[PDB]
């Protein structure tokens, strides 16, 4: 539920 | 001191002094600031917020340990201590003498007006700044300010943590970490129940996180403003 979260992780 | 150690805390510096500029150069990009019209503060500093998301997402990717966390872990770390590590970073500008955020010039001055002009009460402000007091007094080396920030954001205790067991054990090389580095490398008096001040700085978070979140639900309780923050703020906070 949280992509921009998540491509500033990978 | 061991050496596992030693290079911890040259990780957390180096990652520290890479995702925050003491010049605040990046702040012309963000929306102007307006001092003259209520919440005529949001824009600028939503965008701070924002930025300062970024800036503690790629801090975190450094944590020694993160990395091996899961996906949805890391999110649900990221989401509940961001506004917290913002908190804790933002310590580096507060400045006693007149109680604010000095970011460089009067523009990126930020006081307790100007935080009231962005939609937030008393309520919050009022021990937000007596929170930056008195971790201020604590006058940590920048080794204790940077592994506070990675032991808020690797905490066990978070709701919706799958792996509550890797986490701490993540938190607790940094506690050991952190409670070897205040015997060997801060002298008294500075380092007097020093680990046991910073941990209860580590609890008021939580108690500055709640009333966030609740003047945050009733800011973005209007449409009008919950579209003048910005998409990360949103998918972070909302
Ligand atoms: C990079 C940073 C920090 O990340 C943020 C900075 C200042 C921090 C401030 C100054 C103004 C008021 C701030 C932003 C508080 C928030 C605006 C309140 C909660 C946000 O929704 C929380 C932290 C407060 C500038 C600079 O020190």
Redesign the interface.
């Known amino acids: 539920n949280?992509?921009?979260?998540?491509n500033?992780?990978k | 001191l061991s050496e596992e150690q030693q290079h911890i805390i040259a990780i957390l510096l180096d990652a520290h002094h890479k995702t925050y500029d003491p010049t605040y150069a990046d702040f012309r990009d963000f929306r102007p600031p307006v001092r003259m019209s209520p919440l005529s503060m949001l824009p600028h500093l939503a965008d701070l917020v924002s930025y300062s998301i970024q800036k503690v997402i790629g801090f975190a990717k450094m944590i020694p340990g993160f990395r091996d966390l899961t996906s949805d872990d890391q999110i649900v770390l990221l989401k509940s201590s961001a506004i917290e590590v913002i908190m804790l970073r933002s310590n580096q500008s507060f400045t006693m003498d007149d109680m604010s955020w000095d970011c460089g010039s009067q523009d990126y001055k930020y006081d307790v007006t100007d935080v009231s002009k962005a939609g937030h009460t008393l309520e919050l402000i009022e021990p937000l700044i007596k929170f930056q007091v008195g971790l201020k007094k604590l006058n940590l080396h920048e080794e204790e300010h940077v592994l506070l920030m990675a032991i808020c954001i690797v905490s066990p205790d978070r709701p919706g943590v799958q792996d509550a067991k890797l986490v701490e054990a993540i938190q607790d090389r940094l506690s050991n970490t952190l409670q070897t580095y205040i015997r060997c490398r801060h002298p008294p008096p500075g380092s007097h129940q020093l680990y046991a001040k910073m941990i209860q700085k580590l609890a008021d978070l939580r108690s500055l996180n709640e009333e966030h979140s609740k003047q945050y639900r009733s800011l973005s309780f209007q449409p009008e403003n919950s579209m003048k923050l910005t998409p990360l703020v949103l998918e972070v906070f909302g």
């Open positions: 949280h992509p921009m979260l998540m500033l992780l």
